[PDB]
Amino acid sequence: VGRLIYTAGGYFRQSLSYLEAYNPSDGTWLRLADLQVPRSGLAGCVVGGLLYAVGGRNNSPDGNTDSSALDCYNPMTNQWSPCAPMSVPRNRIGVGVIDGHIYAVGGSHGCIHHNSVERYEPERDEWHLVAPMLTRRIGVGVAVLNRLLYAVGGFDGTNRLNSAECYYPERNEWRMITAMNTIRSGAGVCVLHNCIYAAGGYDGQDQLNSVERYDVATATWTFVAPMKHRRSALGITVHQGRIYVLGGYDGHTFLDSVECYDPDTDTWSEVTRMTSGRSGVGVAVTMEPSRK
Ligand SMILES: [Cl-]
Ligand SMILES: [Cl-]
Ligand SMILES: [Cl-]
Ligand code: NA
Ligand code: NA
Ligand code: NA
Ligand code: NA
Ligand code: NA
Ligand code: NA
């Protein structure tokens, strides 16, 4: 019945295997089954109650490799299971879910900065390429609003981006929308109360604490209250009508801070500290694990 905030993987000196679940009510962190492979720069999402870990990169003292992997965690068994991999490795990926399908957007593979996009069908365990973005985007933020897919910011290999573009599944076409006020790579992007939020990131000079919100009806981005802590490569999710931001990098430290945005008051507050600081996590929300 209760839902937890799951954080998977991340980076602190090397990529991490942690899966931990935060209970915003009783404050606990539950330590769950490790990822099969340590990964940073991955994304998390939930479909049908199952948690998915998508893409990323294994930075290890034995060597570094970008990842095409898709893996699925079932809270009712506390077990990970592999899925079919993506067509290419995608480090610093963004993902969104439309109609029960997972869209993997952008990211990098070595020196390749992807504009390509592909779609996963859980009911067939198959990926299929769809139309590529207008822009190559690593560290791209992704959100779904009214069954359209939005790709926000990122880094094209040369320039960091304030542009955003919108994918129409029925047309299989990408269209540019209004750009953000601020250039951001590695921002946290999510949807809350029918608006897209973009929090934090890196503009090529500073890590950011500013937060802006996109309203489709007006096609305008508007600043809201900034986070307490500047952070790039943060994890973000929505739980019970509030945004949570987890970890990240502030130019000096890998943060363990978790901040929570209340839209009704337009206020951020620090609510917990992760068990260790890290950046580049995948985050999503689903039902708590079966006690056993
Ligand atoms: Cl590509
Ligand atoms: Cl919820
Ligand atoms: Cl994520
Ligand atoms: Na592992
Ligand atoms: Na995500
Ligand atoms: Na896989
Ligand atoms: Na298929
Ligand atoms: Na960044
Ligand atoms: Na707005």
Curated annotation (Swiss-Prot):
Post-translational modification: Non-enzymatic covalent modifications of reactive cysteines by electrophile metabolites inactivate the BCR(KEAP1) complex. Accumulation of fumarate promotes the formation of cysteine S-succination (S-(2-succinyl)cysteine), leading to inactivate the BCR(KEAP1) complex and promote NFE2L2/NRF2 nuclear accumulation and activation. Nitric oxide-dependent 8-Nitro-cGMP formation promotes cysteine guanylation (S-cGMP-cysteine), leading to NFE2L2/NRF2 nuclear accumulation and activation. Degraded via a proteasomal-independent process during selective autophagy: interaction with phosphorylated SQSTM1/p62 sequesters KEAP1 in inclusion bodies, leading to its degradation.
Residue numbers bearing the S-cGMP-cysteine modification: C111
Organism taxonomic ancestry: Eukaryota, Metazoa, Chordata, Craniata, Vertebrata
Effect of Y249A: Loss of interaction with NFE2L2/NRF2. Strongly reduces repression of NFE2L2/NRF2-dependent gene expression. Loss of interaction with PGAM5. Abolishes interaction with SQSTM1/p62
Effect of G41C: In a lung adenocarcinoma cell line; also in NSCLC cell lines; strongly reduces interaction with NFE2L2/NRF2 and reduces repression of NFE2L2/NRF2-dependent gene expression
Protein known as: Kelch-like ECH-associated protein 1
Entry remark concerning the domains of this protein: KEAP1 contains reactive cysteine residues that act as sensors for endogenously produced and exogenously encountered small molecules, which react with sulfhydryl groups and modify the cysteine sensors, leading to impair ability of the BCR(KEAP1) complex to ubiquitinate target proteins. The Kelch repeats mediate interaction with NFE2L2/NRF2, BPTF and PGAM5.
Quaternary structure note: Component of the BCR(KEAP1) E3 ubiquitin ligase complex, at least composed of 2 molecules of CUL3, 2 molecules of KEAP1, and RBX1. Interacts with NFE2L2/NRF2; the interaction is direct. Forms a ternary complex with NFE2L2/NRF2 and PGAM5. Interacts with (phosphorylated) SQSTM1/p62; the interaction is direct and inactivates the BCR(KEAP1) complex by sequestering it in inclusion bodies, promoting its degradation. Interacts with NFE2L1. Interacts with BPTF and PTMA. Interacts with MAP1LC3B. Interacts indirectly with ENC1. Interacts with SESN1 and SESN2. Interacts with HSP90AA1 and HSP90AB1. (Microbial infection) Interacts with ebolavirus protein VP24; this interaction activates transcription factor NFE2L2/NRF2 by blocking its interaction with KEAP1.
Family statement: Belongs to the KEAP1 family.
Residues carrying the site annotation Sensor for electrophilic agents: C111
Expression tissues: Broadly expressed, with highest levels in skeletal muscle.
Function: Substrate-specific adapter of a BCR (BTB-CUL3-RBX1) E3 ubiquitin ligase complex that regulates the response to oxidative stress by targeting NFE2L2/NRF2 for ubiquitination. KEAP1 acts as a key sensor of oxidative and electrophilic stress: in normal conditions, the BCR(KEAP1) complex mediates ubiquitination and degradation of NFE2L2/NRF2, a transcription factor regulating expression of many cytoprotective genes.
Compartments it resides in: Cytoplasm; Nucleus
Residues annotated with S-(2-succinyl)cysteine modification: S290
Full-sequence portion shown in this chain: 324 to 615 of 624
Natural source organism: Homo sapiens
Kelch repeat feature ranges: 4-49, 50-100, 101-147, 148-194, 195-241, 242-288
